[PDB]
A paper describes a structure:
MrpH resides at the tip of mannose-resistant Proteus-like (MR/P) fimbriae and is required for MR/P-dependent adherence to surfaces. MrpH is a two-domain adhesin (TDA) consisting of an N-terminal receptor binding domain (NTD) joined through a short linker to a C-terminal pilin domain that attaches the TDA to the fimbrial tip. Although MR/P belongs to a well-known class of adhesive fimbriae encoded by the chaperone-usher pathway, we found that MrpH has a dramatically different structure compared with other tip-located adhesins in this family. Unexpectedly, MrpH was found to bind a zinc cation, which we show is essential for MR/P-mediated biofilm formation and adherence to red blood cells.
The structure of MrpH153 was solved to 1.02 Å resolution using single anomalous dispersion, and the structure of the longer MrpH159 construct solved to 1.75 Å by molecular replacement using MrpH153 as the search model. The two structures are very similar, with an r.m.s.d. of 0.45 Å between 129 Cα atoms. In both MrpH153 and MrpH159, a metal bound by three histidine (His 72, His 74, His 117) side chains was found. Similar electron density, consistent with the binding of a carboxyl group ligand, was present also in the MrpH159 difference electron density map. No tartrate was included in MrpH159 storage buffer or crystallization conditions, and tartrate did not fit the density. We therefore concluded that an unknown ligand, possibly a (di)carboxylic acid, had been picked up by MrpH159 during protein expression. Since our TSA experiments showed stabilization of MrpH159 by glutamic acid (increasing the Tm by 7.9°C), but not by glutamine, aspartic acid, or asparagine, we decided to test if glutamic acid could explain the difference electron density. We found that a molecule of glutamate could convincingly be fitted in the density with the side chain carboxyl group ligating the zinc ion, resulting in a 1.4%-unit Rfree decrease following refinement, so we have assigned glutamic acid as the bound ligand in the MrpH159 structure. In addition to the carboxyl group interactions with the protein, which are the same as for tartrate, there is also a water-mediated hydrogen bond interaction with the side chain of Asn 82, and a salt bridge from the Glu main chain carboxylate to the guanidinium group of Arg 118. The ligand-binding site together with the crevice extending from the ligand-binding site across the positively charged top surface of MrpHntd might allow MrpH to accommodate an extended ligand or receptor with a carboxyl group for binding to the Zn2+ in the metal binding site. It is interesting to note that MrpHntd was thermally more stable in the presence of glutamate, but not aspartate, glutamine, or asparagine, indicating some level of specific binding to the glutamic acid side chain.
Author numbering: 25 to 158
Write the structure that this text describes.
């Protein structure tokens, strides 16, 4: 799984600044495929749930192009090579009202590198608000 959690949500449900931690991404040993393999363009990003359905907002930043990577394990290899973990920082949400159970910052896949991301979703196995085991 991919473990991330928000440690502070400053503001209101519809206008918030999140402080977050993406703490750990466990090895990918079950053969899960990259859900955006074969798209013309796909990014893995740090992004947040923007709607009640969990679709992506404006990403904090993009980590890598991944549309040529067939498996989720290959995506993990590229993310862990290019970013030291834990990934920590802030991002912002302005849009639909989200309660704490609807807030989440994590690793999204998406075709766009900036702007609201209706086709962006958390990568498979993303856990929001749950700490990893020691
Ligand atoms: N930077 C955008 C954030 C949009 C979002 O919630 O993804 C704004 O403040 O309008
Ligand atoms: Zn948002």
């Amino acid at each position: 799984s991919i473990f991330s959690y928000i440690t502070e949500s400053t503001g209101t449900p519809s206008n918030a600044t999140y402080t977050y931690v993406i703490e750990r991404w466990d090895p990918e040993t079950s053969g899960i495929l990259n859900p955006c393999y074969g798209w013309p363009v796909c990014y893995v990003t740090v992004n947040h749930k923007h709607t009640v359905n969990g679709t992506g907002g404006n990403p904090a930043f993009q980590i890598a192009r991944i549309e040529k990577l067939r498996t989720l394990a290959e995506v993990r290899d590229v993310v862990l090579k290019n970013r030291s973990f834990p990934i920590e920082g802030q991002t912002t949400h302005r849009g639909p009202s989200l309660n704490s159970n609807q807030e989440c910052v994590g690793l999204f896949y998406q075709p766009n590198s900036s702007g609201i991301s209706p086709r962006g979703k958390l990568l498979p196995g993303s856990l929001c608000g749950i700490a990893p085991p020691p």
